[PDB]
Amino acid sequence: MKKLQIAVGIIRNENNEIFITRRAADAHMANKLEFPGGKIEMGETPEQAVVRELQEEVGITPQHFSLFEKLEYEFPDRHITLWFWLVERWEGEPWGKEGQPGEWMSLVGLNADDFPPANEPVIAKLKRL
Ligand SMILES: Nc1nc2c([nH]c(=O)n2[C@H]2C[C@H](O)[C@@H](COP(=O)(O)O)O2)c(=O)[nH]1
Ligand SMILES: [Mg+2]
């Protein structure tokens, strides 16, 4: 079967703003407004998957932990698990290896349009704030 897991955590900055990968720092993918922690799927545990990938997607030392929301849905012949974790702080700039560098933005205005549309089920909840 076709199934893939994803665990992410919105890093909280020093100004109630979270650092998320958006249009990279100088890339073309402007609709890549996503978060770190992806790839947890690999072969980790529901708990170590994020905690492990966290170091891989942050590399820094941030007071980051707890989950904000987690959901598991499967598309017509596809299985996508998206876990959203809550973060409270992060020292310096987050690097790890998420993919496309981001900037400290206000999560109160998340972009469900810029980020993957099929991945709205998660944002549809928080987006409505
Ligand atoms: N089944 C399913 N998987 C999806 C959808 N959208 C989406 O990004 N995914 C997948 C692809 C990605 O690899 C992953 C999210 O993190 P990455 O883009 O970093 O891999 O989940 C979808 O609509 N259905
Ligand atoms: Mg990763």
Tab-separated table of N, CA and C and ligand atoms in Angstrom:
chain	number	residue	atom	x	y	z
A	1	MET	N	0.839	-1.226	0.000
A	1	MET	CA	0.000	0.000	0.000
A	1	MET	C	0.862	1.259	0.000
A	2	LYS	N	0.255	2.386	-0.359
A	2	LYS	CA	0.967	3.657	-0.402
A	2	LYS	C	0.614	4.520	0.806
A	3	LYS	N	1.549	4.630	1.743
A	3	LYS	CA	1.337	5.425	2.947
A	3	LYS	C	2.599	6.196	3.318
A	4	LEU	N	2.419	7.419	3.808
A	4	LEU	CA	3.545	8.258	4.200
A	4	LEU	C	3.184	9.130	5.400
A	5	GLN	N	4.086	9.185	6.375
A	5	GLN	CA	3.864	9.972	7.584
A	5	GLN	C	4.638	11.281	7.560
A	6	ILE	N	4.108	12.266	8.271
A	6	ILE	CA	4.728	13.571	8.366
A	6	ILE	C	4.480	14.186	9.739
A	7	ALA	N	5.553	14.597	10.399
A	7	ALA	CA	5.449	15.222	11.709
A	7	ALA	C	6.138	16.569	11.672
A	8	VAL	N	5.434	17.619	12.051
A	8	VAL	CA	6.024	18.945	12.014
A	8	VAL	C	5.758	19.726	13.290
A	9	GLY	N	6.544	20.775	13.487
A	9	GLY	CA	6.393	21.612	14.655
A	9	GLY	C	6.628	23.074	14.334
A	10	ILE	N	5.592	23.892	14.487
A	10	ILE	CA	5.715	25.324	14.210
A	10	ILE	C	6.571	25.980	15.287
A	11	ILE	N	7.785	26.383	14.917
A	11	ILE	CA	8.705	26.999	15.872
A	11	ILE	C	8.251	28.397	16.265
A	12	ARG	N	8.139	28.622	17.568
A	12	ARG	CA	7.715	29.914	18.094
A	12	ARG	C	8.903	30.824	18.364
A	13	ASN	N	8.879	31.995	17.733
A	13	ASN	CA	9.938	32.989	17.889
A	13	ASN	C	9.777	33.782	19.177
A	14	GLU	N	10.610	34.800	19.301
A	14	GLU	CA	10.627	35.672	20.472
A	14	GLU	C	9.545	36.755	20.409
A	15	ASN	N	8.698	36.718	19.384
A	15	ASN	CA	7.643	37.718	19.244
A	15	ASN	C	6.337	37.084	18.773
A	16	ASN	N	5.907	36.035	19.472
A	16	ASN	CA	4.671	35.327	19.132
A	16	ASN	C	4.579	35.054	17.630
A	17	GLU	N	5.733	35.009	16.973
A	17	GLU	CA	5.798	34.735	15.546
A	17	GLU	C	6.536	33.426	15.333
A	18	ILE	N	6.040	32.591	14.437
A	18	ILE	CA	6.669	31.301	14.199
A	18	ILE	C	7.437	31.270	12.881
A	19	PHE	N	8.603	30.634	12.922
A	19	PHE	CA	9.458	30.502	11.752
A	19	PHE	C	9.037	29.291	10.921
A	20	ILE	N	8.518	29.551	9.730
A	20	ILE	CA	8.079	28.492	8.840
A	20	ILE	C	8.696	28.684	7.460
A	21	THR	N	8.925	27.589	6.747
A	21	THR	CA	9.508	27.673	5.415
A	21	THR	C	8.498	28.266	4.441
A	22	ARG	N	8.776	29.478	3.970
A	22	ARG	CA	7.883	30.158	3.038
A	22	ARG	C	8.658	30.769	1.878
A	23	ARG	N	8.339	30.327	0.665
A	23	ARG	CA	8.999	30.829	-0.538
A	23	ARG	C	10.519	30.845	-0.378
A	24	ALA	N	11.034	29.971	0.486
A	24	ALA	CA	12.472	29.888	0.729
A	24	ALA	C	13.084	31.271	0.936
A	25	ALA	N	14.412	31.332	0.934
A	25	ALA	CA	15.119	32.593	1.119
A	25	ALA	C	15.398	33.266	-0.221
A	26	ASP	N	15.557	32.456	-1.262
A	26	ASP	CA	15.827	32.972	-2.598
A	26	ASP	C	15.539	31.913	-3.658
A	27	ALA	N	14.537	31.081	-3.397
A	27	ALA	CA	14.158	30.023	-4.327
A	27	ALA	C	13.003	30.465	-5.220
A	28	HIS	N	12.408	29.508	-5.926
A	28	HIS	CA	11.292	29.799	-6.819
A	28	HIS	C	9.979	29.292	-6.231
A	29	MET	N	10.039	28.150	-5.554
A	29	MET	CA	8.854	27.560	-4.944
A	29	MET	C	8.243	28.505	-3.914
A	30	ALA	N	7.381	29.402	-4.381
A	30	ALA	CA	6.727	30.365	-3.503
A	30	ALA	C	5.551	29.735	-2.761
A	31	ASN	N	5.054	28.615	-3.280
A	31	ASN	CA	3.929	27.922	-2.663
A	31	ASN	C	4.412	26.788	-1.761
A	32	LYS	N	5.587	26.971	-1.166
A	32	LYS	CA	6.162	25.962	-0.282
A	32	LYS	C	6.070	26.387	1.176
A	33	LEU	N	5.087	27.222	1.470
A	33	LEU	CA	4.872	27.716	2.826
A	33	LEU	C	4.531	26.567	3.774
A	34	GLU	N	5.538	25.773	4.133
A	34	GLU	CA	5.329	24.636	5.025
A	34	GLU	C	6.108	24.786	6.329
A	35	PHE	N	6.086	23.732	7.142
A	35	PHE	CA	6.774	23.734	8.431
A	35	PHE	C	7.845	22.643	8.501
A	36	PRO	N	8.702	22.697	9.538
A	36	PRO	CA	9.785	21.729	9.743
A	36	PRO	C	9.322	20.436	10.412
A	37	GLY	N	10.187	19.428	10.373
A	37	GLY	CA	9.891	18.140	10.982
A	37	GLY	C	9.467	17.061	9.995
A	38	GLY	N	9.299	17.425	8.739
A	38	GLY	CA	8.907	16.464	7.723
A	38	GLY	C	9.891	15.312	7.571
A	39	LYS	N	9.421	14.201	6.986
A	39	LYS	CA	10.251	13.017	6.748
A	39	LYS	C	10.299	12.074	7.948
A	40	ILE	N	9.645	12.446	9.042
A	40	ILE	CA	9.630	11.599	10.236
A	40	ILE	C	9.249	10.170	9.881
A	41	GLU	N	8.478	10.053	8.811
A	41	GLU	CA	8.009	8.769	8.313
A	41	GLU	C	9.125	7.732	8.321
A	42	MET	N	10.183	8.012	7.554
A	42	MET	CA	11.355	7.128	7.446
A	42	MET	C	11.128	5.768	8.110
A	43	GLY	N	11.286	5.719	9.432
A	43	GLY	CA	11.095	4.475	10.153
A	43	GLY	C	11.230	4.634	11.651
A	44	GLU	N	10.836	5.791	12.147
A	44	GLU	CA	10.915	6.079	13.576
A	44	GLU	C	9.608	5.721	14.281
A	45	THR	N	9.491	6.116	15.548
A	45	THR	CA	8.292	5.836	16.328
A	45	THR	C	7.407	7.076	16.400
A	46	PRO	N	6.087	6.897	16.566
A	46	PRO	CA	5.142	8.010	16.653
A	46	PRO	C	5.646	9.141	17.550
A	47	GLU	N	6.531	8.808	18.487
A	47	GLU	CA	7.077	9.801	19.406
A	47	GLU	C	8.492	10.230	19.009
A	48	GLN	N	9.326	9.271	18.614
A	48	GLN	CA	10.703	9.572	18.228
A	48	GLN	C	10.784	10.106	16.801
A	49	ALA	N	9.737	9.872	16.018
A	49	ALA	CA	9.700	10.328	14.636
A	49	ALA	C	9.887	11.836	14.552
A	50	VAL	N	9.116	12.569	15.345
A	50	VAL	CA	9.209	14.024	15.357
A	50	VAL	C	10.417	14.481	16.170
A	51	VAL	N	10.562	13.916	17.366
A	51	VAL	CA	11.660	14.266	18.257
A	51	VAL	C	13.008	14.051	17.582
A	52	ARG	N	13.097	13.010	16.763
A	52	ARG	CA	14.337	12.711	16.065
A	52	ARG	C	14.526	13.648	14.879
A	53	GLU	N	13.507	13.734	14.032
A	53	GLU	CA	13.560	14.601	12.863
A	53	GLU	C	13.678	16.062	13.281
A	54	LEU	N	13.265	16.362	14.512
A	54	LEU	CA	13.327	17.725	15.022
A	54	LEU	C	14.756	18.249	14.989
A	55	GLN	N	15.693	17.419	15.431
A	55	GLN	CA	17.097	17.798	15.432
A	55	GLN	C	17.597	17.918	14.000
A	56	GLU	N	17.017	17.106	13.123
A	56	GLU	CA	17.380	17.106	11.716
A	56	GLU	C	16.761	18.286	10.989
A	57	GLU	N	15.643	18.792	11.504
A	57	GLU	CA	14.970	19.902	10.850
A	57	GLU	C	15.109	21.215	11.620
A	58	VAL	N	15.903	21.206	12.687
A	58	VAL	CA	16.131	22.413	13.469
A	58	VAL	C	17.616	22.570	13.769
A	59	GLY	N	18.244	21.471	14.174
A	59	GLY	CA	19.664	21.478	14.474
A	59	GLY	C	20.066	22.392	15.621
A	60	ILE	N	19.224	23.360	15.938
A	60	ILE	CA	19.495	24.308	16.994
A	60	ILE	C	18.995	23.806	18.342
A	61	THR	N	19.129	24.650	19.357
A	61	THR	CA	18.696	24.315	20.691
A	61	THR	C	17.561	25.236	21.121
A	62	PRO	N	16.309	24.871	20.811
A	62	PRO	CA	15.145	25.670	21.112
A	62	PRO	C	14.220	25.042	22.141
A	63	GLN	N	13.589	25.865	22.974
A	63	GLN	CA	12.623	25.333	23.914
A	63	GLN	C	11.392	25.010	23.091
A	64	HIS	N	11.467	23.868	22.429
A	64	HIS	CA	10.428	23.419	21.519
A	64	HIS	C	9.881	22.065	21.939
A	65	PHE	N	8.561	21.982	22.081
A	65	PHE	CA	7.927	20.742	22.489
A	65	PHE	C	6.411	20.888	22.590
A	66	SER	N	5.721	19.748	22.690
A	66	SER	CA	4.261	19.711	22.805
A	66	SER	C	3.615	19.706	21.426
A	67	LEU	N	2.396	19.181	21.346
A	67	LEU	CA	1.682	19.118	20.077
A	67	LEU	C	0.489	20.067	20.064
A	68	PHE	N	0.311	20.763	18.946
A	68	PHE	CA	-0.794	21.700	18.793
A	68	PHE	C	-2.001	20.990	18.186
A	69	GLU	N	-1.726	20.082	17.257
A	69	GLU	CA	-2.773	19.319	16.592
A	69	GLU	C	-2.163	18.218	15.730
A	70	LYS	N	-2.835	17.078	15.665
A	70	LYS	CA	-2.355	15.959	14.865
A	70	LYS	C	-3.528	15.230	14.216
A	71	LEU	N	-3.420	14.961	12.919
A	71	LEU	CA	-4.487	14.272	12.201
A	71	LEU	C	-3.925	13.277	11.192
A	72	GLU	N	-4.689	12.222	10.930
A	72	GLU	CA	-4.282	11.192	9.988
A	72	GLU	C	-5.400	10.914	8.985
A	73	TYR	N	-5.183	11.314	7.736
A	73	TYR	CA	-6.172	11.106	6.684
A	73	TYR	C	-5.539	10.427	5.475
A	74	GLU	N	-6.335	9.643	4.755
A	74	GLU	CA	-5.843	8.941	3.575
A	74	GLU	C	-6.630	9.333	2.331
A	75	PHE	N	-5.900	9.697	1.287
A	75	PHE	CA	-6.495	10.091	0.022
A	75	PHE	C	-6.926	8.860	-0.775
A	76	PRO	N	-7.790	9.046	-1.789
A	76	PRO	CA	-8.282	7.955	-2.634
A	76	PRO	C	-7.149	7.095	-3.185
A	77	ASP	N	-6.713	6.139	-2.369
A	77	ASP	CA	-5.627	5.209	-2.714
A	77	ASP	C	-4.279	5.715	-2.207
A	78	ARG	N	-4.317	6.685	-1.298
A	78	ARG	CA	-3.105	7.251	-0.723
A	78	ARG	C	-3.271	7.446	0.782
A	79	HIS	N	-2.170	7.358	1.521
A	79	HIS	CA	-2.211	7.523	2.970
A	79	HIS	C	-1.208	8.577	3.428
A	80	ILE	N	-1.719	9.691	3.945
A	80	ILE	CA	-0.870	10.773	4.418
A	80	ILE	C	-1.179	11.113	5.874
A	81	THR	N	-0.177	10.968	6.730
A	81	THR	CA	-0.330	11.278	8.145
A	81	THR	C	0.393	12.579	8.471
A	82	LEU	N	-0.350	13.579	8.935
A	82	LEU	CA	0.248	14.868	9.260
A	82	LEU	C	0.081	15.214	10.735
A	83	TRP	N	1.202	15.276	11.448
A	83	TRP	CA	1.192	15.617	12.863
A	83	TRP	C	1.747	17.019	13.064
A	84	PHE	N	0.950	17.886	13.669
A	84	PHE	CA	1.385	19.255	13.922
A	84	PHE	C	1.738	19.441	15.395
A	85	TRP	N	2.989	19.812	15.650
A	85	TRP	CA	3.477	19.998	17.011
A	85	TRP	C	3.646	21.473	17.363
A	86	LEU	N	3.455	21.786	18.642
A	86	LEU	CA	3.568	23.155	19.131
A	86	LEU	C	4.959	23.434	19.702
A	87	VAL	N	5.476	24.615	19.391
A	87	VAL	CA	6.793	25.055	19.851
A	87	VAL	C	6.673	26.354	20.601
A	88	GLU	N	7.500	26.551	21.617
A	88	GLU	CA	7.395	27.782	22.383
A	88	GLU	C	8.576	28.746	22.195
A	89	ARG	N	9.757	28.242	21.858
A	89	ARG	CA	10.917	29.118	21.689
A	89	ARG	C	12.028	28.426	20.905
A	90	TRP	N	12.955	29.219	20.370
A	90	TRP	CA	14.078	28.675	19.618
A	90	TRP	C	15.256	29.649	19.599
A	91	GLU	N	16.424	29.173	20.040
A	91	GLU	CA	17.622	30.007	20.079
A	91	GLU	C	18.176	30.245	18.678
A	92	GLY	N	18.680	31.454	18.445
A	92	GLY	CA	19.239	31.794	17.148
A	92	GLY	C	18.283	31.513	16.007
A	93	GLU	N	18.825	31.063	14.879
A	93	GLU	CA	18.013	30.752	13.709
A	93	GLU	C	17.926	29.240	13.508
A	94	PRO	N	16.733	28.714	13.169
A	94	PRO	CA	16.532	27.281	12.948
A	94	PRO	C	17.115	26.832	11.618
A	95	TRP	N	17.928	25.780	11.643
A	95	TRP	CA	18.538	25.292	10.416
A	95	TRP	C	18.180	23.843	10.125
A	96	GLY	N	18.586	22.952	11.018
A	96	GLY	CA	18.320	21.534	10.838
A	96	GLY	C	18.508	21.066	9.404
A	97	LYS	N	17.403	20.979	8.664
A	97	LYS	CA	17.436	20.541	7.269
A	97	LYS	C	16.021	20.381	6.708
A	98	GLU	N	15.130	21.299	7.075
A	98	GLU	CA	13.747	21.263	6.602
A	98	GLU	C	13.694	21.299	5.079
A	99	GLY	N	14.417	22.246	4.487
A	99	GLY	CA	14.437	22.361	3.041
A	99	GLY	C	14.624	23.788	2.559
A	100	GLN	N	13.620	24.629	2.788
A	100	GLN	CA	13.677	26.023	2.359
A	100	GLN	C	13.615	26.980	3.541
A	101	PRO	N	14.715	27.708	3.792
A	101	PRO	CA	14.800	28.678	4.886
A	101	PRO	C	13.548	29.546	5.003
A	102	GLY	N	13.199	29.912	6.232
A	102	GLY	CA	12.023	30.733	6.459
A	102	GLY	C	12.315	31.960	7.307
A	103	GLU	N	11.297	32.790	7.513
A	103	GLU	CA	11.440	34.003	8.314
A	103	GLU	C	10.418	34.019	9.447
A	104	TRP	N	10.704	34.774	10.504
A	104	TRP	CA	9.788	34.852	11.640
A	104	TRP	C	8.502	35.564	11.231
A	105	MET	N	7.430	34.792	11.086
A	105	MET	CA	6.134	35.340	10.696
A	105	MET	C	5.076	35.064	11.757
A	106	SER	N	3.967	35.793	11.688
A	106	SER	CA	2.877	35.611	12.637
A	106	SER	C	1.979	34.457	12.202
A	107	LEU	N	1.952	33.397	13.004
A	107	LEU	CA	1.137	32.225	12.696
A	107	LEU	C	-0.346	32.580	12.617
A	108	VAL	N	-0.717	33.722	13.194
A	108	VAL	CA	-2.105	34.170	13.180
A	108	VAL	C	-2.600	34.431	11.755
A	109	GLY	N	-1.684	34.396	10.790
A	109	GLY	CA	-2.049	34.624	9.407
A	109	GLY	C	-1.429	33.595	8.487
A	110	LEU	N	-1.623	32.327	8.826
A	110	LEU	CA	-1.080	31.226	8.043
A	110	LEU	C	-1.663	31.228	6.632
A	111	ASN	N	-0.885	30.742	5.668
A	111	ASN	CA	-1.321	30.721	4.275
A	111	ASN	C	-1.668	29.319	3.789
A	112	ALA	N	-2.958	28.992	3.814
A	112	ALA	CA	-3.424	27.696	3.341
A	112	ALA	C	-3.342	27.630	1.815
A	113	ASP	N	-3.341	28.801	1.178
A	113	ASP	CA	-3.266	28.891	-0.276
A	113	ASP	C	-1.835	28.691	-0.775
A	114	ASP	N	-0.883	29.345	-0.112
A	114	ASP	CA	0.523	29.249	-0.498
A	114	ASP	C	1.063	27.842	-0.269
A	115	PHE	N	0.709	27.255	0.866
A	115	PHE	CA	1.153	25.908	1.198
A	115	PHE	C	0.304	24.888	0.431
A	116	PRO	N	0.628	23.585	0.508
A	116	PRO	CA	-0.125	22.556	-0.215
A	116	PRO	C	-1.623	22.614	0.089
A	117	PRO	N	-2.470	22.669	-0.960
A	117	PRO	CA	-3.927	22.735	-0.800
A	117	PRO	C	-4.513	21.438	-0.255
A	118	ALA	N	-3.944	20.314	-0.673
A	118	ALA	CA	-4.411	19.010	-0.217
A	118	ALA	C	-4.049	18.771	1.242
A	119	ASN	N	-3.227	19.654	1.783
A	119	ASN	CA	-2.788	19.558	3.164
A	119	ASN	C	-3.515	20.583	4.038
A	120	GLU	N	-4.674	21.043	3.561
A	120	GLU	CA	-5.476	22.042	4.270
A	120	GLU	C	-6.190	21.484	5.508
A	121	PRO	N	-6.587	20.196	5.523
A	121	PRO	CA	-7.298	19.618	6.670
A	121	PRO	C	-6.689	20.020	8.015
A	122	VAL	N	-5.373	20.196	8.043
A	122	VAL	CA	-4.680	20.601	9.259
A	122	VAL	C	-4.855	22.095	9.501
A	123	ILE	N	-4.566	22.881	8.470
A	123	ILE	CA	-4.671	24.329	8.555
A	123	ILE	C	-6.120	24.780	8.661
A	124	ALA	N	-7.029	24.025	8.067
A	124	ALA	CA	-8.443	24.371	8.114
A	124	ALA	C	-8.906	24.542	9.556
A	125	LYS	N	-8.236	23.844	10.471
A	125	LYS	CA	-8.581	23.917	11.888
A	125	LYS	C	-7.998	25.166	12.555
A	126	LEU	N	-6.690	25.363	12.409
A	126	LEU	CA	-6.010	26.508	13.014
A	126	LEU	C	-6.238	27.787	12.216
A	127	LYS	N	-6.355	27.653	10.902
A	127	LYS	CA	-6.570	28.801	10.029
A	127	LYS	C	-7.766	29.615	10.490
A	128	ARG	N	-8.830	28.913	10.857
A	128	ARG	CA	-10.033	29.561	11.341
A	128	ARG	C	-9.763	30.208	12.696
A	129	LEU	N	-8.574	29.940	13.243
A	129	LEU	CA	-8.175	30.495	14.531
A	129	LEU	C	-9.291	30.359	15.565
B	1	LIG	N1	-1.767	11.193	0.559
B	1	LIG	C1	-1.412	12.480	0.438
B	1	LIG	N2	-0.099	12.848	0.755
B	1	LIG	C2	0.174	14.232	0.602
B	1	LIG	C3	-0.764	15.151	0.175
B	1	LIG	N3	-0.145	16.374	0.149
B	1	LIG	C4	1.164	16.279	0.542
B	1	LIG	O1	2.022	17.226	0.619
B	1	LIG	N4	1.345	14.950	0.820
B	1	LIG	C5	2.643	14.403	1.276
B	1	LIG	C6	3.861	14.708	0.399
B	1	LIG	C7	5.018	15.151	1.300
B	1	LIG	O2	6.161	14.309	1.129
B	1	LIG	C8	4.503	15.120	2.740
B	1	LIG	C9	4.655	16.455	3.473
B	1	LIG	O3	6.024	16.759	3.753
B	1	LIG	P1	7.120	16.820	2.575
B	1	LIG	O4	6.627	17.723	1.510
B	1	LIG	O5	8.360	17.539	3.308
B	1	LIG	O6	7.526	15.441	2.225
B	1	LIG	O7	3.206	14.531	2.588
B	1	LIG	C10	-2.004	14.698	-0.108
B	1	LIG	O8	-2.885	15.536	-0.509
B	1	LIG	N5	-2.369	13.362	0.012
B	2	MG	MG	13.409	15.852	7.724
